[PDB]
Design a protein around this ligand. Structure first.
Ligand SMILES: [Mn+2]
Length: 664
């Protein structure tokens, strides 16, 4: 059913993806790399004292605080959902090999019994209504760019000046490039305007992954992570193999002279993609206004800030169902891309813009280094983009694509299993739009709070209520998938956007509270995804600009966890045993240094201003800006802090661009 074309780096098609500069050329050739991350300044992830600390702490916490999750996946009591063994990884050393990204998910979806299009006309109207509501009356805003982010194919520039030039030129030339693509002249659009080419595959660490302690021997077992070899990826699973990657860390002693303590493993590695920035800029120019619309008009369903902001909504529900989606990005359907594009064309969106948008979700992928002596291969032909990878992580509107698919998928699940009497309200496009507009504002008796593949489904006092309980029962039983679109299950230990929903004896949303996930505190403090990058002079360009700041927001983020105090004391005791030092004093020093360093970046901040004016969100984001890409948005961050991490293209240039894209 059609193998995707593949080209080695030596091939001209792959060579064309990399500009004649050191950064781009290094990116093309970058071999498999592994090594200990600098967890904190002067501390490596594999430091023997640090691993001794992690061994003692993970064992102690699991022992004293076993998971409190009921048969329905509801968290109660201590607020713990699993063991604390997830920290037992040799950060910077990946599982081998990493997966080759699937060039086509058509067979993956078909074999998982998932739909190749909207099942009913109602569903077709609902997916189309989602497009209409999300993309309608948009307001232009400056195109914001993350400082230090790469422009990827073809330039691989990290320079803000160069990135602003690229983005402004892209907004000027998007029309001409889109029109070339409409003529099937993809190579011309890429050669002239760098719009096309491929996504650049980077493998990102999922620093913590499941580990269990088998009671019979007291030996640890890491969660098997299935990977596709090259053959499987190009054939969409028709040929080749899907097998468990090796997380065995024994190799580190022989290869690097690193002592590997018992029950420590290599990290899970996930595919992540970097989009060609010239193609992403025109997409982002529309995506940001869309976010502003959905987070304002549809704030009920889409705008999530604090644990209390989420709590106010959930407390009003009679039933709360915390869902889980299996491998969202890889299962994301291409037919949805086509439906979205078709509906945007119907709305009167510029055909050239829709073509750029369509093309961004069919683009080839350049595979770097999944393992030693593997990779450096382009999948798909950039002359005619036709990949079905699912959702590319580096596409300019990935969050919106995931949110659109999932919001409608959950609504359809609630309609199918709990609310058939609402079907008559969805007769045509105007009525589908009225219903969806009402549903998204939380005005219906069936409700939801969602962001991409994370959601909580709600039922108020209902006639759909009884159906809601049957659906929850079906999810617990787990024998039948409740959706035709994606593989849905219930979350084992229900959480929403990092916050655990802590139930009491009644097991009802009305008396349940949202608390910080204590395990995430431990993940963030002891298993960061990246090193401190102390060699990167401009801190605003680092993956972790001000790590010390997370100490100041810790009480606010995690304080409500039942075991918060117990964990901090266990950390102090274990850190004393391993280093002969106070962890609290160590973090207070890092906080002091990072607070002082921050004033250099903030114009409004005097030489020794302090953190008084900053919110806990601002502090969590300054320690980890990756939270700005999955947890929060621009509006949630103080304006003076947003300027530290982002720079923008003028609203004058974007306003003119947006007027040319949008209907009338
Ligand atoms: Mn969840």
């Amino acid at each position: 059913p059609r193998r995707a074309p593949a080209f080695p780096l030596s091939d001209i098609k792959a060579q064309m993806l990399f500009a004649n500069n050191i950064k781009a050329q290094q990116a093309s050739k970058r071999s498999f790399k592994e090594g200990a991350i600098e967890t904190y300044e002067g501390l490596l992830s594999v430091d023997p004292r640090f691993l001794s600390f992690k061994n003692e702490l993970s064992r102690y916490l699991t022992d004293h605080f076993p998971a409190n999750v009921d048969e329905y996946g509801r968290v109660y009591g201590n607020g713990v959902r699993t063991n604390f063994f997830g920290m037992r990884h040799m950060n910077g050393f990946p599982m081998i090999p990493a997966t080759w990204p699937l060039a086509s998910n058509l067979k993956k979806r078909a074999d998982a019994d998932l739909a190749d299009g909207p099942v009913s006309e109602r569903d077709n109207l609902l997916f189309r209504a989602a497009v209409r509501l999300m993309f309608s009356d948009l307001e232009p805003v400056p195109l914001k760019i993350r400082k230090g982010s790469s422009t990827c194919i073809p330039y691989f520039s990290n320079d803000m000046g160069t990135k602003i030039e690229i983005a402004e030129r892209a907004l000027e030339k998007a029309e001409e490039a889109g029109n070339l693509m409409l003529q099937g002249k993809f190579d011309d659009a890429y050669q002239l305007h760098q719009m096309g080419g491929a996504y650049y595959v980077v493998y990102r660490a999922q620093s913590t992954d499941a580990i269990t302690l088998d009671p019979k021997t007291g030996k640890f077992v890491s969660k098997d992570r299935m990977v596709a070899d090259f053959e499987y990826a190009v054939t969409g699973g028709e040929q080749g193999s899907l097998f468990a990657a090796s997380k065995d860390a024994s190799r580190l002693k022989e290869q690097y002279g690193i002592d590997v303590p018992d029950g420590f493993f290599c990290e899970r590695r996930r595919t992540a993609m970097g989009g060609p920035f010239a193609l992403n800029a025109p997409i982002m120019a529309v995506a940001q206004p869309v976010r502003n619309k959905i987070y304002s008009k549809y704030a009920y369903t889409f705008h999530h800030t604090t644990r209390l902001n989420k709590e106010e909504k959930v407390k009003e529900w009679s039933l709360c169902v915390a869902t889980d989606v299996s491998d969202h990005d890889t299962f994301w359907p291409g037919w949805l891309r086509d439906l979205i594009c078709d509906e945007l064309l119907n709305m009167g969106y510029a055909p050239w813009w829709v073509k750029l948008f369509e093309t961004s979700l069919k683009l080839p992928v350049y595979v770097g280094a999944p393992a030693p002596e593997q990779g450096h291969t382009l999948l798909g032909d950039p002359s005619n983009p036709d990949l079905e990878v699912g959702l590319s992580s580096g596409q300019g509107a990935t969050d919106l694509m995931g949110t659109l698919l999932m919001s409608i998928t959950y609504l359809v699940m609630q309609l199918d299993h709990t609310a058939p009497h609402l079907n008559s309200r969805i007769k045509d496009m105007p009525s589908a739009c009225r219903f969806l507009d009402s549903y998204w504002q939380g005005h219906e008796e069936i409700r939801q709070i969602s962001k991409s593949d994370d959601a909580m489904l709600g039922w108020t006092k209902g006639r759909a209520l009884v159906g809601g309980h049957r659906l929850f029962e079906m999810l617990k039983e787990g024998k039948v998938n409740p959706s035709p679109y994606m593989k849905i299950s219930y979350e084992h230990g229900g959480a929403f956007l990092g916050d655990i929903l802590l139930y009491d004896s009644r097991r009802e949303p009305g008396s349940a509270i949202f608390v910080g996930n204590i395990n995430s505190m431990l993940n963030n403090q002891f298993s960061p995804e990246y090193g401190v990058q102390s060699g990167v002079r401009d801190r605003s360009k680092r993956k972790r600009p001000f790590p010390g700041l997370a100490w100041a927001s810790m009480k606010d983020t995690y304080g409500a966890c039942p075991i918060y105090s117990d964990v901090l004391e266990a950390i102090e005791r274990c850190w004393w045993n391993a280093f002969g030092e106070s962890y609290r004093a160590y973090r207070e020093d890092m906080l002091k240094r990072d607070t002082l360093e921050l004033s250099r970046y903030v114009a409004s901040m005097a030489r020794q201003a302090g953190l008084a004016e900053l919110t806990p969100i601002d502090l969590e984001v300054l320690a980890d800006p990756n939270k700005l890409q999955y947890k929060w948005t621009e509006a949630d961050v103080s304006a003076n802090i947003h300027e530290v991490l982002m720079h923008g293209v003028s609203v004058e240039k974007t306003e003119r661009f947006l007027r040319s894209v949008m209907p009338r």
